[PDB]
Design a protein around this ligand. Structure first.
Ligand code: K
Ligand code: K
Lengths: 53, 101, 534, 530, 53, 77, 84
C-alpha cells in the first residue's frame, strides 16, 4: 500500500532526486497548452486584452 | 377566501421564515396571528399589527409575515384569522412550522 | 530577378485581340465624358425642416466640406485617404404660397465655432425666400491652410443655413405644427480630385468614420441592459448607464461586455442559507462577473418565502386579470426588485431538479440584505433553493438572465440611486437645445404574465463596435443617423463621444416601428437636429 | 442647361493653382491608378496530388477580377473591354512542371478533362524569371454587358505537366502556390451611371464570414466559445446552417435568445407539449435545439449513475473512477433550460426544465427525429393541480442532461430535421470539419465535447447578405495560431467548412483568420503546421 | 471477468481518463472511410446529390 | 467489367490496335489518382502494385491512347 | 495596391527610396503622420536545411541613407536639447 504510492510520485521522486545528486534539471519548461486549463485561460486572456486597452 | 402558498415549512435555526395569509373578498379586514404548540399559545399580530413581544424579530404584511430570524421555540403551529371590519366575512388558515434542529 | 508593379511577359489574347473598332461602338451608343459622370449633375443629399418654432438667427444644417456631401464620393473615398477641391450646391424649398418667410445660406471659413444668432449674416449671405420657386446654385471652395486634407480632418470650410426671417402661417395659429421642408443637392467642381490610394483593408490612425454604429432595421436592435428588442424611444433630461456603455476612446466605467451570455459563478454555503454570495469565474474587472446586471434593490428586505401581490393596502391578492383595477399594485412580497435568472446547480450530491436564481447586487449584512448603490466582490446577491443542509455544498451555478421581479415599479434606469456604479456614472443633460434619450425595450415579470418597461442607453451593436473599433468624433460633435418609420415620418439621432444618444425634439409619439437607419454626417452639439413627423 | 440660378454672392473662388500644389506633394499625375498597375485577386495550391487535367483557376470575365473595379460596378450597369492578368508561381528555379491556359469563348462552360487542349492553348513553366500576362479579350453578340451576363469570354487554366517537388513529400504544405494579379485593359470602360440603392446586392464579397480573432467565436448549436476543430469525412446539421442563398432547412434564427412557449396541462402533470409563439417555421419556437433522446423514457424523477454495479457516484472522480457511467434516470439525454414560468396562480418559484424532440405514449416519450408542433416536449415541475393551467413560459438553454456518452452530433440518426439533412463529403482532397465547442451537464460539475458546423457569426451574415459565389468554389480563409502553425479553410456554397489537411494535432488557439480569395473546390488546401 | 471487460472499455476509458486530467484530446478527427459504413453513405449521398438539383 | 463498359462494346465499333489501351483516369476524393487501361479484349488493367482504402466518391476521365506494354501512371496518398 | 516584389535569389541589394508625402511645408520632429514602408510576404520560402525548433537561416538586413533632398530646417540653440 506504499509501493503503489511511489507511482503517484513518479516525477518528483525523479526530480527531487536528480536535483539532489546533483544536476541542473529544468522540467518546468513547456510551451503547448495541452491541459485544457491553459488554453481556457488563454481564451479569457485574449478576451480581456481585446476590450480593455 | 383564505389560503397559502406553503402550508408546511422546514427551516434550520437562526434563519428566516415567511408565513402567508392570502386573503380575498374583504373590504377593511382586521388580522391576527396566533402561536400554537402543544398547549402553549400567544397572539403575534393584532389589528394588522405586531405585538410588542415579537416586533423586534418579526415583520408584517397583509399578504403574510416574515421573521428576521427564528429559534427552535417557534417550532409548532401558527394560524391566521381574518375578519371584515363589521364581522361580515371570515376565513382562516393554519400553518405548522418545524425548525430543523 | 525583380518584377516591378507592371512587369510581365505579354502573350496576350491567344485566339483574338482586344480590338479598338469595337470599344468605340459601345461608346457611341451610350455616350461618354472624361472618365466620370458625377461631375455633371446634382446628386440628392438630404432634407431637413423649417418650422414656425425656429425663430430668427437659428440654424438648421451645418455640415462641413468633404466627400460625404455626394453619395458617389463617400463611396469612392473608401479608396483614397485624401481629397482636395470644391463643391457646387443646390438647395430649395417645397413650400406653399402662403408660407412666407426667408432663409439664408452661408459658407463660413474654417476655425469658427459659429453661433445660432444673426451676426453671421454680416458675412456674404445668400437668400432663398420660400415663395421662390426656382432653385439656386452656389459653390463651396476649399479654403484651407494645407496643401490638401485627409478624411480624418474635419476643420474645413462649412455650409450653414440660417433663418434670416422666421416662418409664418397666417392660417393655423392654433397648433403651430407647420412644415417647409428643405432639400440640398451637390455637384463637384472639376477642381475636385482625390489623392493617395489607401491600401484596401487598411484603417486610419486618427480613426475611422462612424457609419456602422446602428444597423438598418429595428429587428437587429436590442438594448445594452437586456436582450429584448426595441419597441419605442424615450426622452429624459438626465440619462445615464454604466453596464455596457462604451465611449469612443474604447473605454467604459463598466464591469461587463457587449454580450448576453449565461453567467457562471461559484456559491459556497451551508445551513440552508439560500442567500449565498457569488464569486466570479469570468470577468474583465476582478471580482465582478461579466454580464452581471446594473440594478440595486429598492430597499432592505428578508428572503424566506415566495410571491405575493395585492390590490391595495386593504384588499385582495389579485392573482387574476382583475388586477388593473388597483392602480397601486404594491407587491408586498418576500422580496422585490431582483432580476431573475435561470440556473444549473452542479454540486456533486444534489440529485434534484435545480431551481431558479433571483439575484441582484446588495450587501449581505445577515440573513437579510441591504442596498448596494456601489458594486464590489462582496455585494453579490442570490436567493436560490439550493439543495443544502448543515454541510457546505459548493457548486457552480451557470446563471442566465430572463426577467424581473419588482412588480409595480417604474421602468428601470429612472431610479438613479438604484442604478449601479463602481465609482463613476456617465451622465448628461440637455445639449444645444437637444434632449438625450434612452431606448425602450421590454422585460418580463415573475408572477403575472405581463412585462414592465426597461430603459437603455445604447443599442448593443452600437456598443460592440466601440469596445472594438477606433472611431472618430470630436467632443463638440455628433454622429447624425436618420431614423425612418414605415411611413415617411422621420427624424435624426446624434451621438456624442460618450455614447449617449441625443434628439432635437421633446416628443415622438408612436410610429410604424418597422424602422431603418442611415448615416448622414457630423453635426455639432449646439445645433438642433431634424424632425419630420406628423 | 441644368436647372438653377447661380450667384457670385460668395467671395473667394481661389486659384486652380492649388490643385497643382496638391499634385506637387502627392504624385497624382493621373485620373485613375487601378488602370496602370496590378492588383491581387487570390491564391491557390498546385500541390503534388493534382494531375494532368485538373483546373486551378476559372473565372468568367467581369469586374470581379479586380477588387477595385468591383467596388465601382456598384456605380454602373455596364462594362466593355479586356482585362489583363498576371501570375507568379513561387518556384524560383526549383519546382518542375508547367501549366496550360485557354481563352474559351462565350457560351461554353469548360470541363475538367484534357479535351479542352484540342484548342489553341498557351503553356508556361514554373522555372520562370519573368511572369506571364494574358489579355482576356471581350467577345459578345452585344454592345455592352449588364453586370449580369455571366456568359462571357471565360478564362481557363489546366495542368499539362504535373509538378515535381524535389524534397517535400509532406514537409511544407504544397510549395507550388501561384498568385493571380489583374488589371483592366485600356479598352475597359464602364457605362451608364446608376444610383447606389436601386440595383445592388449582386456581388457582395466573402470577407467577413469569419472574424479576424477567435476569442469571440461561438458555435451554431451552443453559445459556448470554440476550443479547437474536428475533422470528419461526413458532416451534418440543419439548425442554424445558412447557405449562400439566404436559406436553411432549419427552423431557427442565427442567434441565442431565450424561447417563449406555453403549456396547458392538467391532472397535476409535468410532461407536456409546447406550442409556439415566436416562430419562423409554423409550430417551432425559433431557438429549439437539434437532438432527440436515445431511447423510450417515462420521465418521473431525478439523477443517478450507478457505476455498472449499483454503487452511485458523487466522490469527485467517482465519475472518473468508474468503469462505465450508465445513467439510470428517466429524463436522460435531453437538453436543459432555465424556465421562468409566468402564470395566474402559482405564487411560487419557477423550476427549471428539460427539453427535447419526441412523441408521447400518453405519459412516455419516444425519439422521432422529424419535428412539428407535436414532437415538442418539456418536463417541468410547474406547480400544478387538477385544473388546466395555461403556464406561459420562457426558456434559455444551459446544458445536456445525458451523462455517460459522447453522442452530441456524431449520431446522424439522432439529429432533428424538418425533412432533409444537409451533408457533404470530401472534395478534391479537401475534407470537412466540425467546429468543436463545450457544453455542460446537469448533475456533476463536468462538461462535455460538442459539435457544430458553422460559426454563428458566419451563419447570421448569410441570413441577411447576398455574398456572391458559384457552387464550385470556396471562400478561403487563412488561419494561423500563436505558434506559426497555420492552415486554410474553404466554405462551400452550402455553408459547410472544408479543409485540406489530414489532421491537426493541437494548436495555440489564440488565432486569427484572414481572407485570401476564392478557390476551386477540387484543390488541396494548404497547411504547414508543426 | 471485471478485468476482462476493461479491454472493451479500453478506448473510452483512456479518453474519459485523460479528460478528467487537465488534458486536451482530439480522437474524433478521422478522415478516411475505412469502416465500410462511411463508405456506404458516401455512395448514396453522392447519388442522391446527383439527380437532386 | 462495368456493365456500361460492356454495353457500349456490344454496339459501337470502337477503334484500337491489338497492343494498346484506351486509358481512363481515376480520382478518389482524397485527391489521389491512378490510371486504368482497357485492352481490346475488355480486361481492365492497371499499373500500380496496391490500392488499399480510398475516398470512393470518385470520378473518371479520358486521357488518350497508350501502348499496352508500358507501366501506367499513378499517385497515392 | 502597387507592390514591388523581389526574390530570395537576389544578387544586388535593393533600395526603395521612400519619399516625403505631406500636407505641410515642413515636418517637425514630433510628427508621425508620414509615409511608411512595409515588407510583406508574397511567396513562402523554401529550404530543406532547417528544423522546427531552431530557425537559423533567412535574415533580412535593412539599411538606410538620408537621400539627396533630405534637409533639416530651423536651427535652435542647445538648451533646448530635449533629449528624447
Ligand atoms: K441539482
Ligand atoms: K411561478
Amino acid at each position: 500500500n506504499k509501493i503503489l504510492e511511489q507511482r503517484v510520485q513518479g516525477p518528483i521522486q525523479s526530480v527531487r532526486l536528480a536535483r539532489a545528486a546533483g544536476f541542473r534539471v529544468d522540467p518546468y519548461s513547456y510551451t503547448d497548452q495541452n491541459f485544457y486549463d491553459d488554453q481556457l485561460n488563454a481564451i479569457r486572456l485574449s478576451y480581456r486584452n481585446l476590450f480593455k486597452n | 377566501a383564505v389560503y397559502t402558498s406553503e402550508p408546511d415549512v422546514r427551516v434550520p435555526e437562526d434563519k428566516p421564515a415567511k408565513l402567508s395569509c392570502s386573503y380575498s373578498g374583504f373590504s377593511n379586514p382586521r388580522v391576527e396571528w396566533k402561536f400554537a404548540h402543544g398547549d402553549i399559545t400567544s397572539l403575534v399580530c393584532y389589528k394588522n399589527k405586531i405585538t410588542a413581544s415579537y416586533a423586534d424579530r418579526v415583520t408584517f404584511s397583509h399578504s403574510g409575515i416574515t421573521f428576521h430570524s427564528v429559534t427552535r421555540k417557534d417550532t409548532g403551529t401558527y394560524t391566521c384569522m381574518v375578519s371584515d371590519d363589521g364581522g361580515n366575512t371570515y376565513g382562516e388558515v393554519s400553518v405548522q412550522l418545524t425548525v430543523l434542529v | 530577378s525583380i518584377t516591378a508593379p507592371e512587369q510581365g511577359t505579354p502573350v496576350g489574347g491567344v485566339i483574338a485581340e482586344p480590338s479598338a473598332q469595337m470599344s468605340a461602338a459601345a461608346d457611341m451608343a451610350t455616350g461618354k465624358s472624361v472618365d466620370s459622370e458625377w461631375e455633371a449633375f446634382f446628386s440628392f443629399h438630404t432634407s431637413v425642416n423649417w418650422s414656425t418654432s425656429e425663430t430668427q438667427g437659428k440654424i438648421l444644417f451645418k455640415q462641413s466640406l468633404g466627400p460625404l456631401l455626394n453619395p458617389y464620393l463617400e463611396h469612392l473615398a473608401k479608396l483614397y485617404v485624401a481629397w482636395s477641391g470644391s463643391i457646387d450646391v443646390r438647395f430649395s424649398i417645397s413650400g406653399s404660397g402662403v408660407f412666407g418667410g426667408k432663409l439664408a445660406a452661408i459658407v463660413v471659413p474654417p476655425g469658427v465655432d459659429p453661433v445660432q444668432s444673426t451676426s453671421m449674416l454680416q458675412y456674404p449671405h445668400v437668400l432663398f425666400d420660400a415663395r421662390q420657386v426656382e432653385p439656386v446654385i452656389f459653390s463651396i471652395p476649399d479654403l484651407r491652410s494645407t496643401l490638401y486634407h485627409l478624411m480624418s480632418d474635419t476643420d474645413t470650410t462649412s455650409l450653414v443655413i440660417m433663418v434670416y426671417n422666421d416662418l409664418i402661417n397666417p392660417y393655423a395659429n392654433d397648433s403651430n405644427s407647420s412644415g417647409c421642408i428643405v432639400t440640398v443637392e451637390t455637384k463637384p467642381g472639376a477642381d475636385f480630385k482625390f489623392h493617395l490610394l489607401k491600401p484596401p483593408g487598411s484603417m486610419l490612425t486618427h480613426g475611422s468614420v462612424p457609419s456602422d454604429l446602428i444597423p438598418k432595421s429595428s429587428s437587429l436592435w436590442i438594448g445594452n441592459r437586456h436582450w429584448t428588442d426595441i419597441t419605442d424611444f424615450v426622452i429624459r433630461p438626465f440619462v445615464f448607464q454604466a453596464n455596457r456603455h462604451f465611449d469612443f476612446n474604447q473605454e467604459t466605467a463598466g464591469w461587463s461586455t457587449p454580450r448576453y451570455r449565461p453567467i457562471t459563478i461559484t456559491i459556497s454555503e451551508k445551513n440552508g442559507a439560500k442567500l449565498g454570495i457569488g464569486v466570479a469565474t469570468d470577468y474583465i474587472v476582478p471580482g465582478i462577473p461579466d454580464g452581471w446586471p446594473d440594478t440595486t434593490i429598492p430597499e432592505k428586505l428578508t428572503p424566506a418565502g415566495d410571491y405575493a401581490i395585492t390590490n391595495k393596502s386593504g384588499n385582495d391578492i389579485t392573482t387574476a386579470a382583475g388586477y388593473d383595477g388597483a392602480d397601486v399594485i404594491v407587491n408586498n412580497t418576500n422580496f422585490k426588485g431582483m432580476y431573475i435568472c435561470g440556473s444549473l446547480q452542479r454540486a456533486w450530491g444534489d440529485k434534484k431538479i435545480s431551481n431558479t436564481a433571483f439575484i441582484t447586487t446588495a450587501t449581505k449584512v445577515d440573513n437579510a440584505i441591504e442596498p448596494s448603490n456601489v458594486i464590489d466582490m462582496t455585494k453579490i446577491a442570490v436567493y436560490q433553493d439550493t439543495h443544502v443542509g448543515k454541510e457546505v455544498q459548493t457548486s457552480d451555478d451557470t446563471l442566465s438572465l430572463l426577467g424581473y421581479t419588482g412588480i409595480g415599479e417604474q421602468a428601470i434606469g429612472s431610479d438613479r440611486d438604484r442604478v449601479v456604479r463602481i465609482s463613476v456614472l456617465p451622465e448628461t443633460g440637455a445639449r444645444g437645445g437637444n434632449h438625450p434619450i434612452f431606448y425602450k425595450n421590454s422585460i418580463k415579470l415573475g408572477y403575472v404574465i405581463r412585462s414592465i418597461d426597461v430603459f437603455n442607453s445604447q443599442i448593443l451593436h452600437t456598443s460592440r463596435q466601440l469596445s472594438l473599433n477606433h472611431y472618430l468624433l470630436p467632443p463638440d460633435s455628433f454622429a447624425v443617423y436618420r431614423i425612418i418609420d414605415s411611413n415617411g415620418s422621420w427624424f435624426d439621432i446624434g451621438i456624442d463621444s460618450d455614447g449617449f444618444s441625443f434628439v432635437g425634439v421633446s416628443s415622438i409619439g408612436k410610429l410604424e416601428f418597422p424602422l431603418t437607419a442611415s448615416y448622414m454626417g457630423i453635426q455639432l452639439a449646439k445645433i438642433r437636429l431634424a424632425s419630420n413627423i406628423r
